[PDB]
Amino acid sequence: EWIPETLYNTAISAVVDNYIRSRRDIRSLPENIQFDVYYKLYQQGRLCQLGSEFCELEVFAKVLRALDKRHLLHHCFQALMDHGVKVASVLAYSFSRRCSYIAESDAAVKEKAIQVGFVLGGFLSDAGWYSDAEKVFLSCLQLCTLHDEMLHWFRAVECCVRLLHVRNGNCKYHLGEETFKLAQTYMDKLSKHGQQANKAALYGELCALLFAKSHYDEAYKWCIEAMKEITAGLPVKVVVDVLRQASKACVVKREFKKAEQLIKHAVYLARDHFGSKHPKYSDTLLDYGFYLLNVDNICQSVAIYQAALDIRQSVFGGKNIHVATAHEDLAYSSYVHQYSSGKFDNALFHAERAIGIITHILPEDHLLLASSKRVKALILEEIAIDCHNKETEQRLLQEAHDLHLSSLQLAKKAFGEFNVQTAKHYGNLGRLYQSMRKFKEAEEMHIKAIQIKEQLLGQEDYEVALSVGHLASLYNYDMNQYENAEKLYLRSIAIGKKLFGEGYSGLEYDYRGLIKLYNSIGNYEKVFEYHNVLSNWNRLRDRQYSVTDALEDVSTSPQSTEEVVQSFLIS
């Protein structure tokens, strides 16, 4: 149609083409214009002319007030970080140095810089630079501690709710508890002095910290406490933040009726306000796909991580931890979904991507690098079985052995010996030893895996049953201890149908194993007794398979706020 360009979009391209002469005068332009000049520099690809200005804190304070075009700033910021220049670490250090100089000032200048820190530290934390956002908040925190009145106590607890969030994406859990304890010190002081603070966002972080350390018993306790303080006056960003973390603790609690209403309300609440492109919406989808994968709704769990990844791949550039986290979970979901098929080439690409990103931006001994490392190892051991080349079978299976042990060490260093995540690596390493023909070694890993999970989770739980089936296949298919395997298969059968029914698609490896269990010990009557149940499993799975996609399952306005909270709280 050949429509001419607006005079604005023409004057933008004429001051950018004359940027060297006009760099001094551009910084004096209004915020809406100034960001559009800088975004034009990114569009032209002149990142050096741009990162020379974002490294200054004052300019990055001006381009942080453009809230409409923040989604363009994240892609412009992430492009700088991959370009070279450490624009995140320079901004965080340049703020801490400037923040440390106004300690001997009044409460007007200090509140000006604290608000800069809350939008800068609120941006680096949003872009994934948790190790660099914490340095901003730790400087904002020490501004609130200087003045000990009722006014600044509400900001010190506003830093500690954010410090507790940048210390979980950075997997610094052992500092998280000390942060929460310091928050209560600034909460009890404020609450006692005739001013009650909303303790809803802060307890939501503990619903993810204690979830991360596999304290699901403690996670659900703070899940209830978080939602008891949900008020309609809270920001939607805070409210959707509590819901997604509350869902993750409820799903791992293996109760799914209360879990769906929390996260489907969260996805709706993060889609009507934030829209289908804001990273927070994709953040909710990532936790929504956690619900789908644990309820055996694996078919549409891949489609919700792919949606979650595609949002983050557009807002958060190439090499970002948030993109890498989506690559990790999508690789795991594609691993689970296509486990039966045995084809892992898209899943391997996603798992390899999540390591090519995290190893670039995180140290070699980071906990989040360990969880993303186990997913490649799970994929590698299946390729090391499906491939028919013995040389490839041995070497690829050995590579997956170094990844689990490296992943186990990082989990064992921070989560301790007695945790589900540490035991989750024992079970994965147990399955690997089964494929490595080390059936003697595979016995003691699963025994240590079940004993840790049984002691912590309980005698009957979904995670315990899924670990037993790993041991049951060991005692049945390649160790010939059918008497020992007889109770193990039955143990997982009861738990498997306890929370999913007979149509649980994971029972295929449980029912078929029972058929091979009875094939070598006689009693062929029970072979047909389990043979029709496998057909019953076939009938009860494909009939319920036909269901609409979860993206439209939430639809438009399914329920209302302050109603899902009350419905969940009373139950």
Binding site: V336, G342, N428, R431, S473
Partner: peptide, 7 residues
């Protein structure tokens, strides 16, 4: 395939 989905 006999060990179900890896945890």
């Amino acid at each position: 395939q006999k060990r179900a989905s890896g945890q």
